[PDB]
Symmetry: C3
Subunit: 251 residues, 3 copies
């Protein structure tokens, strides 16, 4: 099972555990992740869903260049549409969760490997965490909700600049931009911080939390759903163009 699940004190922990691809995003992990998010969402008794990685070195490597290359080489678009469908549903199901959603970024989180977590209510990173948005050099458009979330979180102009620079950036920079909400210095502090955070969530009333999130989001989930569809079409179109195959090959 590409992801592990456990409920403790009325909170669901979803742990990415896919060493073969370093927590990479493909159709199989995606399907397993989606199932887990949906189970948490449908679980009346929990108040929170925590997304995390089991592996010290990384949170998620994101979509794998090797896997993308296969999609570029595929002339049917089926492989590409397949993986995007599942991962897009993961993003949407996180975004529309009635539970308080938190992502714990312990290690590096590249591309969609970070971006999917932008759908969470809060993102907390270890100091050592590193981030990367590499669409520009790859010759592709942003996906997995990135075109929706980035401008809304950090602003359009800063999004264009972040994508243009395509740098490995620090947790400090991510905090400054508002991509993440806070930084913990080490594993133990993160562990304590999370415990305290969930204690605070538990003092609320589950249906009130759900209504609150619903009201705050308003028409956003409808907008995101539409944007995910547009991202899909733009990316598929680009993946039919030789330049994209060439860049993926080179990489």
């Amino acid at each position: 099972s590409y992801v592990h699940t456990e409920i403790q004190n009325d909170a669901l922990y979803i742990t990415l555990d896919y060493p073969e691809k370093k927590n990479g995003l493909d159709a199989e992990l995606g399907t397993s992740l989606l199932e887990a998010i949906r189970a948490g969402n449908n679980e009346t008794s929990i108040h929170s869903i925590i997304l995390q990685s089991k592996h010290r070195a990384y949170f998620s490597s994101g979509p794998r260049l090797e896997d993308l290359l296969i999609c570029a080489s595929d002339q049917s678009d089926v492989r590409l549409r397949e993986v995007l469908h599942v991962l897009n549903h993961c993003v949407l199901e996180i975004f529309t969760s009635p539970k308080v959603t938190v992502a714990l970024i312990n290690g590096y989180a590249y591309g969609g490997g970070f971006n999917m977590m932008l759908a969470c209510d809060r993102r907390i990173a270890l100091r050592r965490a590193k981030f990367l948005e590499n669409f520009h050099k790859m010759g592709i458009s942003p996906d997995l909700g990135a075109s929706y979330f980035l401008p809304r979180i950090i602003g359009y102009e800063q999004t264009m600049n972040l994508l243009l620079e395509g740098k490995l950036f620090t947790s400090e920079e991510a905090l400054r931009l508002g991509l993440i909400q806070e930084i913990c210095e080490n594993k133990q502090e993160l562990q304590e911080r999370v415990k305290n955070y969930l204690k605070a969530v538990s003092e609320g009333y589950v249906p009130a939390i759900a209504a609150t999130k619903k009201l705050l989001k308003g028409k956003a989930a409808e907008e995101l759903k539409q944007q995910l569809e547009q991202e899909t079409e733009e990316l598929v179109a680009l993946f039919k163009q030789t330049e994209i195959k060439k860049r993926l090959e080179a990489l």
Copy 2:
């Protein structure tokens, strides 16, 4: 007695909350008088500004009173709740759609909707000693009186979730950092002078141009707010039918 006073001075309408019994708390009686004052100001062609303030040193507004909310949770029907939400939502919408420059002066504490209604104003100025509270999380209710519309637009979604989770009394400095207020004055005298100067700057403008400017800047937002207020109403009414809310209000 009347709990909302009105006065025009030099082409500015001053709306003053005066409800000491309930510390300027929000109920249908105050709401009704407040709405009437807001509309009268919006319909007055000579004024360029509307100033909302409290006549009482200790507090701006305690917001909807716990005891009153407890009554609504105890009610047999939802008629009382819908009635007060109706009047107070209209206050919010009528401030928001005012053609006049709207300013709220937060002198003392402003809790829940006692503060949140004023988020519809063009500018919010607080005394340093002002304190603020958003306590929906512990109360087990959803945000109302526009708070679900204004908070994420002003401070961001992530920040709104965290503010609500913490439910702490917070300072004017914190309110300023978040953008909930636009500036702080240290005392009543300084505030009185600042307002004088600010209204002077406003008066140098042209009333119809000011109205056109506000209309353009807001675009479709007024319709969106109106719809959101309706949704807040339905969500809150649904929660007040659940025994947990009565239990929670009863304990507080």
Copy 3:
């Protein structure tokens, strides 16, 4: 004599404002030339970026000139005003919907629409010495050339109302703080090398991917802006019929 020059260099179109007669003022003449330059750039498959700049050290653009505005105000038909708005509004929209990376280099002062049109660009870079002005409040007019769309989205509603109310000449530092510009360069030469480096970074990408990226990020905003430009025109036209506007322009 053409008031807008174009040159392609390093896979980028440089559009240069060269209108000393009006200190790079915005009229239908310069506007027509600028629009042609923008469209040419947007349809040029061999470039990745469009750079907008001024040839003159003293100013970027003095914006719509008071003298020209007065003429429109004194005119008994709305045709000349609607004609200039039509072309300039198209410049704004066509910058905003450009598939190329768009950068404005603000070297000297930029007043009103002279700055505001550039808010449609992906990046605004100013020389430290640049100065800015939004003077709608004193002029008695509503914001135009997209300003009513861009200002609240970039700096916030409350901050926009205050910016307009104060109508002060402000520094590049303040522009940067507000988010109206993205960065500051100390001098012409550093700016030249910065732009060179920036364009190199852009060139590392793939033109159709840049275009698709911008299209996705913008979503429905292009249609929103187009409608909003139409609203700005409708309101400005109504105000220019009023005696107060002519009086204020003359005074100025």
